[PDB]
């Protein structure tokens, strides 16, 4: 059940954690700060990330993805599935 | 929930079952013997298998994987996700 | 036209160069020392490497391959195609 | 040809230290690291 | 290039087996760098 939601960087980041597993492809949301930006935009733990700023990171290294996300400055817009 | 856990072959084998589905990639744990080795090392049904002895079997045939597992003698060490 | 030939490390290495291209998969022989081990075992420039010590490095990073080759001590046995 | 008592542990310590650092220089690092050891 | 290093060292342990190792490792890699 897919969510497209944009985040606006708060006092503490977008207030969540990216998480990947060692040797599995894919990158996924782990810890959503209640009240934080990720949370209000609807994200939930373990939502799997598909697009960052409209780009498909499924086949990309957790590192490249985390980087992609920070590189967008005030905002970053995510497409996930949960 | 990734688990890295090593098994030591018991009276009954490692006491579990590998299971794959017909035409899906991936291989997964099915039946964990109560009190058996798989069980005490934490494994649970449907935990999906990623590494056998530090090797990535995601893209490998259920057959090749099963074999990989037996090939390790007294022990075999698994990385799974559940 | 495939060659399976084993090398025995000479005064200067196996006397050749591994070479890869930036963003192409595959690793290939570049400079064969005339009279050197690679040369006498028949290798020729641009022979493409397939197996190192019986392992298939086609899908492996130039770095992993070079490493694989040095890791075999006195000898290393190669399967290439040229 | 004797495999003496506790080699794997040594190499292990060193190696795991290489993975947490990856200095562009190794031999210096090894030397220094084992010197740090004995002392 | 790690495997090559440990290999060199190890094969040197098998040809010697000093009752002392850490001293030997230290000394051996010191011999190394200073070589380089």
């Amino acid at each position: 059940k897919p969510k497209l939601c944009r985040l606006a960087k708060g006092e503490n980041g977008y207030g969540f954690h990216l998480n990947a597993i060692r040797g599995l492809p894919g990158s996924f949301i782990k810890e959503v700060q209640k009240g934080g930006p990720a949370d209000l935009a609807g994200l939930e733990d373990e939502d799997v990330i598909i697009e960052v700023n409209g780009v498909n990171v499924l086949d990309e290294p957790y590192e490249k993805v985390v980087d992609r996300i920070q590189s967008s400055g005030k905002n970053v817009t995510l497409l996930v599935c949960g | 929930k990734p688990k890295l856990c090593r098994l030591a072959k018991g009276e009954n084998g490692y006491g579990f079952h590998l299971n794959a589905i017909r035409g899906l990639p991936g291989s997964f744990i099915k039946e964990v013997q109560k009190g058996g080795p798989a069980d005490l090392a934490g494994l649970e049904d449907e935990d999906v298998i990623i590494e056998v002895n530090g090797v990535n079997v995601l893209d490998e045939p259920y057959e090749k994987v099963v074999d990989r597992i037996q090939s390790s003698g007294k022990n075999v060490t698994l990385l799974v996700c559940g | 036209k495939p060659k399976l030939c084993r090398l025995a490390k000479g005064e200067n290495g196996y006397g050749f160069h591994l070479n890869a291209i930036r963003g192409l998969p595959g690793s290939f022989i570049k400079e064969v020392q005339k009279g050197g081990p690679a040369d006498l075992a028949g290798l020729e420039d641009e022979d493409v490497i397939i197996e190192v010590n019986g392992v298939n490095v086609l899908d492996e990073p130039y770095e992993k391959v070079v490493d694989r080759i040095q890791s075999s001590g006195k000898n290393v046995t190669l399967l290439v195609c040229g | 040809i004797q495999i003496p008592p506790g080699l794997t542990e040594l190499l292990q310590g060193y190696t795991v230290e290489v993975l947490r650092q990856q200095p562009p220089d190794l031999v210096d690092f090894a030397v220094e690291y084992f010197t740090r050891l004995r002392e | 290039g790690l495997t090559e290093l440990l290999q060199g060292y190890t094969v040197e342990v098998l040809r010697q087996q000093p009752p002392d190792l850490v001293d030997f490792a230290v000394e051996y890699f010191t011999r190394l760098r200073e070589a380089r």
């Binding site: 969540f16 990216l18 | 890295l4 | 001590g73 | 040809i1 495999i3 795991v16 | 790690l2 290999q7 190890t10």
Partner: peptide, 28 residues
């Protein structure tokens, strides 16, 4: 003594990688 020596080294290696970490989280 070689073949062995390698055995050792490689086995070391996998022993190390499996020494964790098992996951990667970065606060964003």
């Amino acid at each position: 003594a070689w073949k062995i020596a390698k055995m050792i080294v490689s086995d070391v290696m996998q022993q190390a990688q499996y020494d964790q970490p098992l996951e990667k989280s970065t606060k964003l």
